[PDB]
Amino acid sequence: RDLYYNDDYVSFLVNTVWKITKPVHIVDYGCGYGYLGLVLMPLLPEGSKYTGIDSGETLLAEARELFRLLPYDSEFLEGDATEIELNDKYDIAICHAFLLHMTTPETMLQKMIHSVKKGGKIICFEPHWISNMASYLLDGEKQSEFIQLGVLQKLFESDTQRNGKDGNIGMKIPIYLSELGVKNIECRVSDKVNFLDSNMHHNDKNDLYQSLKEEGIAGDPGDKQQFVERLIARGLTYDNALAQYEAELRFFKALHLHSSLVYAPNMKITFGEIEC
Amino acid sequence: RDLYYNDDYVSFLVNTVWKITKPVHIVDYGCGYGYLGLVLMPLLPEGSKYTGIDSGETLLAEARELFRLLPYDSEFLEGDATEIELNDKYDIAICHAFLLHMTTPETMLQKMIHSVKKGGKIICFEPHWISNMASYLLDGEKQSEFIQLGVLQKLFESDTQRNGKDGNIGMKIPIYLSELGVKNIECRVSDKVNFLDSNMHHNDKNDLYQSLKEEGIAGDPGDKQQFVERLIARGLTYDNALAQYEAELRFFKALHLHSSLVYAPNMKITFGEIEC
Ligand SMILES: Nc1ncnc2c1ncn2[C@H]1O[C@H](CSCC[C@H](N)C(=O)O)[C@@H](O)[C@H]1O
Ligand SMILES: Nc1ncnc2c1ncn2[C@H]1O[C@H](CSCC[C@H](N)C(=O)O)[C@@H](O)[C@H]1O
């Protein structure tokens, strides 16, 4: 949450850009444990309703227990978002890091749109891995030493061509929304930038490091052979998978609590309106 | 201007993030024709003073004529920003796409800081070419086809190692500011995303295309031989310079008025405070 979005910036989107003043009925697809709800409900007009959809039974159990303690009206539906049939029309349909797992993104977006009432809105929070990866700066190390953008670029394109899952879908949402007839389409990059400051000595700096590691940043690549073979099987040559391995190994050994790291997740927020 | 920043987002930074309520005395280094002033003065408290510094005589002539028609108190000083000696202390020292042209960024930043009064602020608007380049999506084309991130990554790192000019300095400002003792350092990514919509048929869509081209997006690479030799001389191999050429040629031929393009300049806005 606090690693991808600034609290003040999300409030900016809600109150200034989207100008939401009246309570809204929102549906969140692939809500997980209700992340997007924990982010937006506090900023939405009092009286707003939050409905999350997810197939993970355990996830919904955590979500329910989590929102049980909150003063927000929230409900969670268990079911396959690609087949679930809703009976109501919502003011806003949203999702966070959901569409990138869909083999047929456009279709799922189509379904989300159909669940929105005329004059309603659709907001998608999706990542753009390639811009995310290019948004790294490690003091004392050349980016190309621990991040092979060229290899990553080919790798993410290959995976998408295979199963269909698009890790860079965040920048394509505007186009999918356009083809689907959505109006007033606009995309925005979360303004969030994380800065692990080597000269900041405070508990907050230590907490940021913990969050970074819990997110898997600069994780151990593991067994070299399994790694190279795993990548080669995804559409990469041997010299590419190797360069990638040595790159990840370098990052694993270079990053530590005392380091200076600047990172902008580059999350993509696309929204548009449903033709009245 | 409108290609790199959203009007509402800049106002957000001024009023909500920086919370500037009292009129401020700001100095802009390498102001060019006064771009940053045309952007911030309208949003700053009435009574604010704008002072720009630049070595380009013609540039300052245009700036003066441009601000002559405006209701903002503005003055332009002609001189080398790396040697100019100011007699006053400013509330805020700023710059836009200036530090990337400095061979010794840290030193110039040091000078900017010295021109700021205790309790004052320093705001730097600098680019991050690599994240800018990775932030491209062209419908109907694979990013790796018209943009070689791997080559660009090596290329920009090489240039920096040579003359010292850093095209990716935007993400390093926080670190330079940290070493210089600046407090409350925070970086933000402009939330701007340009979307040339193939399904939008309106004069605004045509204007966006014009702006994109005037900025040099997808420009003709020119003579193949001169191009490859030019890059090789900058620290790249032959197979890299060639891949780069064919990449730029593809973009030049693929992008047109009817295309769907999504682009997030990824400008980096770093700011901090001078200890008082
Ligand atoms: N057909 C489907 N229906 C519902 N959920 C699905 C799905 N296919 C994949 N998912 C899932 O989609 C979610 C996306 S990952 C987590 C998303 C959540 N909004 C967050 O940002 O934390 C997972 O929790 C997982 O259960
Ligand atoms: N030592 C120096 N003193 C003043 N200007 C300098 C300089 N070294 C380079 N420059 C310049 O720095 C500027 C940076 S490019 C333009 C910056 C302007 N803020 C804009 O965004 O439009 C140029 O106008 C050029 O004149």
Coordinates of C-alpha atoms and ligand atoms in Angstrom, one line a residue:
Chain A
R1 CA 0.0 0.0 0.0
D2 CA 2.4 2.6 1.3
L3 CA 5.0 1.3 -1.1
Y4 CA 3.0 2.0 -4.3
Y5 CA 0.8 5.0 -3.5
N6 CA 1.1 8.2 -1.5
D7 CA -2.0 8.8 0.7
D8 CA -2.3 12.4 -0.3
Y9 CA -2.1 11.5 -4.0
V10 CA -4.9 9.0 -3.8
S11 CA -7.0 11.6 -2.0
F12 CA -6.1 13.9 -4.9
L13 CA -7.5 11.5 -7.4
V14 CA -10.7 10.9 -5.4
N15 CA -11.5 14.6 -4.6
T16 CA -9.9 16.6 -7.3
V17 CA -9.5 14.5 -10.4
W18 CA -12.5 12.2 -10.1
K19 CA -14.3 14.7 -7.8
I20 CA -16.4 12.0 -6.0
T21 CA -18.7 13.9 -3.6
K22 CA -21.8 11.6 -3.4
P23 CA -21.6 8.2 -1.8
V24 CA -20.8 5.5 -4.4
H25 CA -21.5 1.8 -4.9
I26 CA -18.3 0.3 -6.0
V27 CA -17.4 -3.3 -7.1
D28 CA -13.8 -4.5 -6.9
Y29 CA -12.8 -7.5 -9.2
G30 CA -10.1 -9.8 -7.8
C31 CA -10.2 -7.9 -4.6
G32 CA -7.9 -10.3 -2.8
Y33 CA -8.2 -9.5 0.9
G34 CA -9.8 -6.1 0.1
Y35 CA -6.7 -4.0 -0.6
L36 CA -8.2 -1.4 -2.8
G37 CA -11.1 -1.1 -0.4
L38 CA -8.8 -0.4 2.5
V39 CA -7.2 2.3 0.3
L40 CA -10.3 4.0 -1.2
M41 CA -13.1 3.6 1.3
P42 CA -11.5 5.9 3.9
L43 CA -11.3 8.6 1.2
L44 CA -14.7 8.0 -0.3
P45 CA -17.9 9.9 0.8
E46 CA -19.5 8.5 4.0
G47 CA -22.2 6.0 3.1
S48 CA -20.3 4.4 0.2
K49 CA -20.7 0.7 -0.4
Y50 CA -17.8 -1.7 -1.2
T51 CA -18.3 -5.0 -2.8
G52 CA -15.3 -7.3 -3.5
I53 CA -15.2 -10.3 -5.8
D54 CA -12.7 -13.1 -5.6
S55 CA -12.3 -16.9 -6.0
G56 CA -10.0 -17.4 -3.0
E57 CA -12.0 -18.7 -0.1
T58 CA -9.3 -18.0 2.4
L59 CA -8.7 -14.6 1.0
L60 CA -12.3 -13.6 1.4
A61 CA -12.2 -15.0 5.0
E62 CA -9.4 -12.6 5.8
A63 CA -11.1 -9.7 4.0
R64 CA -14.3 -10.2 6.0
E65 CA -12.4 -10.4 9.3
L66 CA -10.4 -7.3 8.2
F67 CA -13.4 -5.2 7.3
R68 CA -15.5 -6.5 10.2
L69 CA -13.5 -4.1 12.4
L70 CA -13.9 -1.2 10.0
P71 CA -16.8 1.4 9.9
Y72 CA -17.3 0.8 6.2
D73 CA -20.2 -1.1 4.6
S74 CA -18.4 -4.0 2.8
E75 CA -19.4 -7.3 1.3
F76 CA -17.4 -10.0 -0.4
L77 CA -18.7 -12.4 -3.1
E78 CA -16.9 -15.7 -3.8
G79 CA -16.8 -16.8 -7.4
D80 CA -15.1 -16.8 -10.8
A81 CA -15.0 -13.1 -11.9
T82 CA -15.0 -14.3 -15.5
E83 CA -18.4 -16.0 -15.1
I84 CA -20.0 -14.5 -12.1
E85 CA -23.3 -12.8 -13.0
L86 CA -24.1 -9.7 -11.0
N87 CA -27.7 -8.5 -10.6
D88 CA -26.9 -4.9 -9.7
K89 CA -25.3 -1.9 -11.6
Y90 CA -22.5 -0.1 -9.8
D91 CA -21.4 3.5 -9.8
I92 CA -17.7 2.5 -10.2
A93 CA -16.1 -0.8 -11.2
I94 CA -12.4 -1.1 -10.1
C95 CA -9.6 -3.6 -9.8
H96 CA -6.0 -3.6 -8.6
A97 CA -3.3 -5.8 -10.1
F98 CA -6.0 -8.1 -11.4
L99 CA -6.1 -7.8 -15.2
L100 CA -2.5 -8.8 -15.6
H101 CA -3.5 -12.4 -14.5
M102 CA -6.2 -12.6 -17.1
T103 CA -5.5 -14.6 -20.3
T104 CA -8.1 -12.5 -22.1
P105 CA -7.9 -9.0 -20.5
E106 CA -10.2 -7.3 -23.0
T107 CA -13.1 -9.7 -22.3
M108 CA -12.8 -9.3 -18.5
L109 CA -12.7 -5.5 -19.0
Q110 CA -15.9 -5.8 -21.1
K111 CA -17.6 -7.7 -18.3
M112 CA -16.5 -5.1 -15.7
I113 CA -18.0 -2.3 -18.0
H114 CA -21.3 -4.2 -18.3
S115 CA -21.6 -4.1 -14.5
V116 CA -21.4 -0.3 -14.5
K117 CA -24.4 1.9 -14.7
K118 CA -24.7 4.6 -17.4
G119 CA -22.7 7.6 -16.3
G120 CA -20.7 5.4 -14.1
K121 CA -16.9 5.0 -14.0
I122 CA -14.3 2.2 -14.4
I123 CA -10.9 2.5 -12.7
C124 CA -8.1 0.1 -13.2
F125 CA -4.9 0.0 -11.1
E126 CA -2.5 -2.1 -13.1
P127 CA 1.3 -2.4 -13.2
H128 CA 3.8 -1.8 -16.0
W129 CA 6.6 -4.1 -15.0
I130 CA 9.1 -2.7 -17.7
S131 CA 8.8 0.9 -16.5
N132 CA 8.8 -0.4 -12.9
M133 CA 12.1 -2.2 -13.5
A134 CA 13.6 0.8 -15.4
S135 CA 12.7 2.9 -12.3
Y136 CA 15.6 1.7 -10.1
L137 CA 18.6 3.6 -8.9
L138 CA 21.2 2.1 -6.6
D139 CA 24.0 4.3 -5.3
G140 CA 27.4 2.8 -6.1
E141 CA 26.1 0.5 -8.8
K142 CA 25.3 0.9 -12.5
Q143 CA 21.7 0.0 -13.2
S144 CA 22.8 -2.3 -16.1
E145 CA 24.8 -4.3 -13.6
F146 CA 21.8 -5.5 -11.6
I147 CA 19.0 -5.1 -14.1
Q148 CA 19.1 -6.2 -17.7
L149 CA 16.3 -4.1 -19.2
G150 CA 16.9 -5.6 -22.7
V151 CA 16.5 -9.2 -21.4
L152 CA 13.5 -8.2 -19.2
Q153 CA 11.9 -6.4 -22.2
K154 CA 12.1 -9.6 -24.3
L155 CA 11.1 -11.8 -21.4
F156 CA 7.9 -10.0 -20.5
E157 CA 6.9 -9.8 -24.2
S158 CA 7.4 -13.6 -24.6
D159 CA 5.3 -14.6 -21.6
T160 CA 2.5 -12.4 -22.9
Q161 CA 2.6 -14.1 -26.3
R162 CA 2.3 -17.4 -24.5
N163 CA -0.3 -17.7 -21.8
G164 CA -1.7 -14.2 -22.4
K165 CA -0.9 -12.8 -18.9
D166 CA 0.4 -9.2 -19.5
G167 CA 2.7 -7.8 -16.9
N168 CA 2.8 -4.5 -18.8
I169 CA -1.0 -4.3 -19.2
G170 CA -1.1 -1.1 -17.2
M171 CA -0.3 1.0 -20.3
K172 CA -2.6 -0.9 -22.5
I173 CA -5.8 -0.4 -20.5
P174 CA -6.4 3.0 -22.1
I175 CA -6.4 1.3 -25.5
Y176 CA -8.7 -1.6 -24.4
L177 CA -11.0 0.9 -22.9
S178 CA -11.0 3.0 -26.1
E179 CA -11.9 0.0 -28.3
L180 CA -14.7 -0.9 -25.8
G181 CA -16.3 2.5 -26.3
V182 CA -15.4 4.1 -22.9
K183 CA -15.5 7.9 -22.8
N184 CA -13.2 10.5 -21.2
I185 CA -10.4 8.0 -20.9
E186 CA -7.4 9.2 -18.9
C187 CA -4.4 7.4 -17.5
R188 CA -2.2 8.6 -14.6
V189 CA 1.0 7.3 -13.1
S190 CA 1.0 6.9 -9.3
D191 CA 3.5 9.7 -8.2
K192 CA 5.0 7.4 -5.6
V193 CA 8.8 7.2 -5.2
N194 CA 10.4 5.1 -2.5
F195 CA 13.7 6.4 -1.2
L196 CA 15.8 4.2 1.1
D197 CA 18.1 7.0 2.4
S198 CA 21.6 5.9 3.5
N199 CA 21.8 9.1 5.6
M200 CA 18.5 8.7 7.3
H201 CA 18.9 6.9 10.6
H202 CA 15.4 6.4 12.1
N203 CA 13.0 3.5 12.6
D204 CA 11.1 4.7 9.5
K205 CA 14.1 4.0 7.3
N206 CA 14.4 0.5 8.8
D207 CA 10.7 -0.1 8.2
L208 CA 11.0 0.9 4.6
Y209 CA 13.8 -1.6 4.1
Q210 CA 11.6 -4.4 5.6
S211 CA 8.8 -3.5 3.2
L212 CA 11.1 -3.6 0.3
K213 CA 12.4 -7.0 1.2
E214 CA 8.9 -8.4 2.0
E215 CA 8.0 -7.3 -1.5
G216 CA 10.7 -9.5 -2.9
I217 CA 13.0 -6.7 -4.1
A218 CA 16.5 -8.0 -4.8
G219 CA 15.7 -11.6 -3.7
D220 CA 18.1 -14.5 -4.0
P221 CA 18.0 -16.0 -7.5
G222 CA 18.6 -19.4 -6.1
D223 CA 20.2 -22.3 -8.0
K224 CA 21.9 -21.1 -11.1
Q225 CA 21.1 -24.0 -13.3
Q226 CA 17.4 -24.1 -12.4
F227 CA 17.2 -20.4 -13.0
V228 CA 18.8 -20.4 -16.4
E229 CA 16.7 -23.4 -17.5
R230 CA 13.5 -21.8 -16.1
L231 CA 14.1 -18.6 -18.2
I232 CA 15.2 -20.4 -21.4
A233 CA 11.9 -22.3 -21.1
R234 CA 10.1 -18.9 -21.2
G235 CA 11.6 -17.8 -24.5
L236 CA 15.1 -16.6 -23.8
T237 CA 18.5 -17.7 -25.1
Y238 CA 21.2 -19.0 -22.8
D239 CA 23.3 -15.8 -22.8
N240 CA 20.2 -13.9 -21.9
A241 CA 19.1 -16.1 -19.0
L242 CA 22.7 -16.1 -17.7
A243 CA 23.0 -12.3 -17.9
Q244 CA 19.7 -12.1 -16.1
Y245 CA 20.9 -14.5 -13.4
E246 CA 24.2 -12.6 -12.8
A247 CA 22.1 -9.4 -12.8
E248 CA 19.8 -10.7 -10.1
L249 CA 22.6 -12.2 -8.1
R250 CA 24.4 -8.8 -8.1
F251 CA 21.3 -7.0 -6.9
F252 CA 20.9 -9.6 -4.1
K253 CA 24.4 -9.0 -2.9
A254 CA 24.4 -5.2 -3.4
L255 CA 21.2 -4.2 -1.7
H256 CA 21.2 -3.9 2.1
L257 CA 19.9 -1.8 4.9
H258 CA 22.8 0.7 4.6
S259 CA 22.2 1.2 0.8
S260 CA 20.7 4.3 -0.9
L261 CA 17.9 3.1 -3.3
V262 CA 15.3 5.1 -5.2
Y263 CA 12.4 3.2 -6.7
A264 CA 9.2 4.4 -8.4
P265 CA 6.8 1.4 -8.8
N266 CA 5.2 3.2 -11.8
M267 CA 1.7 1.8 -11.1
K268 CA -0.7 2.8 -13.9
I269 CA -4.1 4.2 -13.0
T270 CA -6.5 4.1 -16.0
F271 CA -10.0 5.4 -15.8
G272 CA -12.8 6.4 -18.1
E273 CA -16.6 6.9 -18.2
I274 CA -19.4 4.6 -19.4
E275 CA -21.4 6.3 -22.1
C276 CA -24.6 7.7 -20.6
Chain B
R1 CA 4.5 21.9 -20.8
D2 CA 1.1 20.1 -21.1
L3 CA 3.0 17.0 -22.4
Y4 CA 4.9 16.5 -19.1
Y5 CA 2.7 17.7 -16.3
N6 CA -1.0 17.8 -15.6
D7 CA -2.2 21.2 -14.4
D8 CA -4.2 19.8 -11.5
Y9 CA -1.3 17.7 -10.4
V10 CA 1.1 20.7 -10.3
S11 CA -1.5 22.6 -8.2
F12 CA -1.7 19.5 -6.0
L13 CA 2.1 19.8 -5.3
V14 CA 1.9 23.5 -4.6
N15 CA -1.2 23.6 -2.4
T16 CA -1.3 20.1 -0.8
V17 CA 2.2 18.6 -0.8
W18 CA 4.3 21.7 -0.4
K19 CA 1.4 23.7 1.1
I20 CA 2.7 27.1 -0.2
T21 CA 0.3 29.7 1.2
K22 CA 2.5 32.8 1.7
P23 CA 4.1 34.6 -1.3
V24 CA 7.5 33.2 -2.1
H25 CA 10.8 34.5 -3.6
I26 CA 11.9 31.8 -6.0
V27 CA 15.1 31.5 -8.1
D28 CA 15.1 29.3 -11.2
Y29 CA 18.5 28.1 -12.5
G30 CA 18.9 27.5 -16.2
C31 CA 15.4 29.0 -16.6
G32 CA 15.6 29.0 -20.4
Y33 CA 12.7 31.2 -21.6
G34 CA 11.1 30.9 -18.2
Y35 CA 9.2 27.6 -18.6
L36 CA 9.0 26.7 -14.9
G37 CA 7.9 30.2 -14.1
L38 CA 5.0 30.0 -16.6
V39 CA 4.0 26.8 -14.8
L40 CA 4.4 27.7 -11.1
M41 CA 3.7 31.5 -10.9
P42 CA 0.1 31.1 -11.8
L43 CA -0.3 28.6 -9.0
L44 CA 1.8 30.4 -6.4
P45 CA 0.3 32.9 -3.9
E46 CA -0.3 36.4 -5.3
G47 CA 2.8 38.6 -4.7
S48 CA 5.4 35.9 -5.3
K49 CA 8.6 36.9 -7.0
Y50 CA 10.2 34.9 -9.9
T51 CA 13.9 35.2 -10.8
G52 CA 15.4 33.2 -13.6
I53 CA 19.1 32.6 -14.3
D54 CA 20.4 31.7 -17.7
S55 CA 23.5 32.2 -20.0
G56 CA 21.5 32.4 -23.2
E57 CA 21.1 36.1 -24.2
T58 CA 18.4 35.3 -26.8
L59 CA 16.6 33.0 -24.4
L60 CA 16.4 35.8 -21.7
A61 CA 15.2 38.2 -24.4
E62 CA 12.3 35.9 -25.2
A63 CA 11.6 35.3 -21.5
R64 CA 11.4 39.0 -20.7
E65 CA 9.0 39.6 -23.6
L66 CA 7.0 36.6 -22.6
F67 CA 6.6 37.7 -18.9
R68 CA 6.2 41.3 -19.9
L69 CA 2.6 40.6 -20.8
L70 CA 2.0 38.6 -17.6
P71 CA 0.8 39.9 -14.2
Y72 CA 3.7 38.3 -12.4
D73 CA 6.7 40.0 -10.9
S74 CA 9.6 38.5 -12.8
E75 CA 13.3 39.3 -13.5
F76 CA 15.9 37.5 -15.5
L77 CA 19.7 37.5 -14.8
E78 CA 22.2 36.7 -17.5
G79 CA 25.3 34.8 -16.4
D80 CA 26.9 31.4 -15.8
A81 CA 24.9 29.7 -13.1
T82 CA 28.1 27.9 -12.0
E83 CA 29.8 31.1 -11.2
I84 CA 27.1 33.7 -10.7
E85 CA 27.2 35.2 -7.2
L86 CA 23.7 36.1 -5.8
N87 CA 23.3 38.7 -3.0
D88 CA 19.9 37.5 -1.8
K89 CA 18.6 34.4 -0.1
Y90 CA 15.5 32.8 -1.7
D91 CA 12.6 30.9 -0.2
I92 CA 12.8 28.3 -2.9
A93 CA 15.5 27.4 -5.4
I94 CA 14.3 25.4 -8.4
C95 CA 15.3 24.2 -11.8
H96 CA 13.8 22.2 -14.7
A97 CA 15.8 19.9 -17.0
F98 CA 18.9 21.8 -16.0
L99 CA 21.1 19.6 -13.9
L100 CA 21.3 16.9 -16.5
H101 CA 23.5 19.3 -18.6
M102 CA 25.9 19.8 -15.7
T103 CA 29.2 17.9 -15.8
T104 CA 29.3 18.2 -12.0
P105 CA 25.7 18.0 -10.7
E106 CA 26.5 17.8 -7.0
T107 CA 28.5 21.1 -7.1
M108 CA 25.7 23.0 -8.9
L109 CA 23.2 21.6 -6.4
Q110 CA 25.4 22.7 -3.6
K111 CA 25.4 26.3 -5.0
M112 CA 21.6 26.2 -5.4
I113 CA 21.3 25.2 -1.8
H114 CA 23.6 28.0 -0.6
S115 CA 21.2 30.5 -2.3
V116 CA 18.3 29.3 -0.2
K117 CA 17.5 30.8 3.2
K118 CA 17.2 28.6 6.3
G119 CA 13.9 26.9 6.4
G120 CA 13.7 27.4 2.6
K121 CA 13.1 24.7 0.0
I122 CA 14.8 23.3 -3.1
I123 CA 12.8 21.7 -5.9
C124 CA 14.4 20.0 -8.9
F125 CA 12.4 18.9 -11.9
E126 CA 14.7 16.5 -13.7
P127 CA 14.2 13.7 -16.3
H128 CA 14.9 10.0 -16.0
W129 CA 15.4 9.0 -19.7
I130 CA 15.6 5.3 -19.1
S131 CA 12.2 5.1 -17.3
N132 CA 10.9 7.6 -19.9
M133 CA 11.9 5.3 -22.7
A134 CA 10.5 2.2 -21.0
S135 CA 7.2 4.1 -20.7
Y136 CA 6.1 3.6 -24.3
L137 CA 3.3 1.5 -25.6
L138 CA 2.4 1.4 -29.3
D139 CA -0.7 -0.5 -30.4
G140 CA 0.2 -3.1 -33.0
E141 CA 3.9 -3.1 -32.2
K142 CA 6.1 -4.9 -29.7
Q143 CA 8.0 -2.3 -27.6
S144 CA 11.3 -4.2 -28.2
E145 CA 10.7 -3.7 -31.9
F146 CA 11.1 0.1 -31.8
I147 CA 12.9 0.6 -28.5
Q148 CA 16.0 -1.3 -27.4
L149 CA 16.0 -0.7 -23.6
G150 CA 19.1 -2.8 -23.2
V151 CA 21.1 -0.7 -25.7
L152 CA 19.7 2.6 -24.3
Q153 CA 20.5 1.5 -20.8
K154 CA 24.2 1.0 -21.8
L155 CA 24.3 4.1 -24.0
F156 CA 23.1 6.5 -21.3
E157 CA 25.4 5.0 -18.7
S158 CA 28.4 5.4 -21.1
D159 CA 27.7 9.1 -21.9
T160 CA 27.5 9.8 -18.1
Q161 CA 30.8 8.1 -17.6
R162 CA 32.3 10.4 -20.3
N163 CA 31.4 14.0 -20.1
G164 CA 29.4 13.7 -16.9
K165 CA 26.0 14.8 -18.2
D166 CA 23.4 12.5 -16.6
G167 CA 20.2 11.9 -18.5
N168 CA 19.0 9.8 -15.6
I169 CA 19.9 12.3 -13.0
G170 CA 16.2 12.7 -11.9
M171 CA 16.4 9.6 -9.7
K172 CA 19.8 10.6 -8.2
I173 CA 18.8 14.0 -7.0
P174 CA 17.4 12.5 -3.8
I175 CA 20.8 11.0 -3.1
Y176 CA 22.8 14.2 -3.9
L177 CA 20.4 16.1 -1.7
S178 CA 20.9 13.6 1.1
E179 CA 24.7 13.8 1.0
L180 CA 24.4 17.7 1.0
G181 CA 22.5 17.6 4.3
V182 CA 19.0 18.5 3.0
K183 CA 16.1 17.5 5.2
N184 CA 12.7 16.0 4.6
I185 CA 13.7 14.8 1.2
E186 CA 10.9 13.4 -1.0
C187 CA 10.7 12.5 -4.7
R188 CA 7.6 12.3 -6.8
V189 CA 6.9 11.2 -10.3
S190 CA 4.8 13.5 -12.4
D191 CA 1.5 11.6 -12.9
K192 CA 1.3 12.7 -16.5
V193 CA 0.4 10.1 -19.2
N194 CA -0.1 11.0 -22.8
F195 CA -2.6 9.0 -24.8
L196 CA -2.9 9.4 -28.5
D197 CA -6.2 7.7 -29.0
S198 CA -6.8 6.1 -32.3
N199 CA -10.6 6.2 -31.6
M200 CA -10.7 9.9 -30.6
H201 CA -11.5 12.1 -33.6
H202 CA -11.3 15.7 -32.5
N203 CA -8.9 18.7 -32.9
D204 CA -7.4 17.9 -29.5
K205 CA -6.2 14.5 -30.7
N206 CA -4.6 16.2 -33.7
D207 CA -3.0 18.8 -31.4
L208 CA -1.5 16.1 -29.2
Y209 CA 0.1 14.4 -32.3
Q210 CA 1.6 17.7 -33.3
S211 CA 3.1 18.2 -29.8
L212 CA 4.5 14.7 -29.8
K213 CA 6.2 15.3 -33.2
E214 CA 7.5 18.7 -32.2
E215 CA 9.1 17.0 -29.2
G216 CA 11.0 14.8 -31.5
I217 CA 9.2 11.6 -30.7
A218 CA 9.8 8.9 -33.4
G219 CA 12.0 11.2 -35.5
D220 CA 13.8 10.1 -38.6
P221 CA 17.2 8.4 -37.6
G222 CA 18.7 9.8 -40.8
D223 CA 21.7 8.3 -42.6
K224 CA 22.4 4.8 -41.4
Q225 CA 26.2 4.9 -41.5
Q226 CA 26.4 8.3 -39.7
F227 CA 24.0 7.0 -37.1
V228 CA 25.9 3.7 -36.3
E229 CA 29.3 5.5 -36.3
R230 CA 27.9 8.2 -34.0
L231 CA 26.7 5.7 -31.5
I232 CA 29.8 3.5 -31.7
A233 CA 31.8 6.6 -30.8
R234 CA 29.7 7.0 -27.7
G235 CA 30.6 3.6 -26.3
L236 CA 28.5 1.0 -28.1
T237 CA 29.3 -2.0 -30.2
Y238 CA 28.3 -2.3 -33.9
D239 CA 25.5 -4.8 -33.3
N240 CA 24.1 -2.5 -30.6
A241 CA 24.2 0.7 -32.7
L242 CA 22.6 -1.2 -35.6
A243 CA 19.8 -2.6 -33.4
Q244 CA 19.3 0.9 -32.2
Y245 CA 19.1 2.3 -35.7
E246 CA 16.6 -0.3 -36.9
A247 CA 14.7 0.3 -33.7
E248 CA 14.4 4.0 -34.3
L249 CA 13.7 3.5 -38.0
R250 CA 10.8 1.2 -37.1
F251 CA 9.3 3.8 -34.7
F252 CA 9.6 6.5 -37.3
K253 CA 7.7 4.4 -39.8
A254 CA 5.2 3.0 -37.3
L255 CA 4.0 6.1 -35.5
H256 CA 1.4 8.3 -37.2
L257 CA -1.7 10.4 -36.6
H258 CA -3.9 7.3 -36.7
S259 CA -1.8 5.3 -34.2
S260 CA -2.7 4.5 -30.5
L261 CA 0.3 5.6 -28.3
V262 CA 0.5 5.8 -24.5
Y263 CA 3.5 7.6 -23.1
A264 CA 4.4 8.6 -19.5
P265 CA 7.4 11.0 -19.6
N266 CA 8.2 10.0 -16.0
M267 CA 9.6 13.4 -15.1
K268 CA 11.2 13.3 -11.6
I269 CA 10.3 16.0 -9.0
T270 CA 12.7 16.0 -6.1
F271 CA 12.5 18.4 -3.2
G272 CA 13.8 18.8 0.3
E273 CA 14.3 21.5 2.9
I274 CA 17.3 23.5 4.1
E275 CA 18.0 22.9 7.8
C276 CA 17.2 26.0 9.9
Ligands
LIG1 N1 -11.5 -15.5 -12.2 C1 -11.1 -15.0 -11.0 N2 -12.1 -14.5 -10.1 C2 -11.6 -14.0 -9.0 N3 -10.4 -13.8 -8.6 C3 -9.4 -14.2 -9.5 C4 -9.7 -14.8 -10.8 N4 -8.5 -15.1 -11.4 C5 -7.5 -14.7 -10.6 N5 -8.0 -14.2 -9.4 C6 -7.3 -13.6 -8.3 O1 -7.2 -12.2 -8.5 C7 -6.5 -11.6 -7.4 C8 -5.4 -10.7 -8.0 S1 -3.9 -10.5 -7.0 C9 -4.6 -9.4 -5.7 C10 -5.5 -8.2 -6.0 C11 -5.9 -7.3 -4.9 N6 -6.8 -6.3 -5.3 C12 -4.6 -6.6 -4.3 O2 -4.1 -5.6 -4.9 O3 -4.1 -7.1 -3.2 C13 -6.0 -12.7 -6.4 O4 -6.4 -12.4 -5.0 C14 -6.7 -14.0 -6.9 O5 -7.6 -14.7 -6.0
LIG2 N1 26.2 27.5 -16.6 C1 24.9 27.8 -17.1 N2 24.3 28.9 -16.7 C2 23.1 29.2 -17.2 N3 22.4 28.4 -18.1 C3 23.0 27.2 -18.4 C4 24.3 26.8 -18.0 N4 24.7 25.6 -18.6 C5 23.7 25.2 -19.4 N5 22.6 26.2 -19.3 C6 21.3 26.2 -20.0 O1 20.4 25.6 -19.1 C7 19.1 25.6 -19.8 C8 18.6 24.2 -19.6 S1 17.4 23.6 -20.9 C9 16.0 24.6 -20.5 C10 15.5 24.7 -19.1 C11 14.1 25.4 -18.9 N6 13.8 25.4 -17.5 C12 13.0 24.6 -19.6 O2 12.6 23.5 -19.1 O3 12.6 25.0 -20.8 C13 19.2 26.2 -21.2 O4 18.2 27.2 -21.5 C14 20.7 26.7 -21.3 O5 20.8 28.1 -21.6

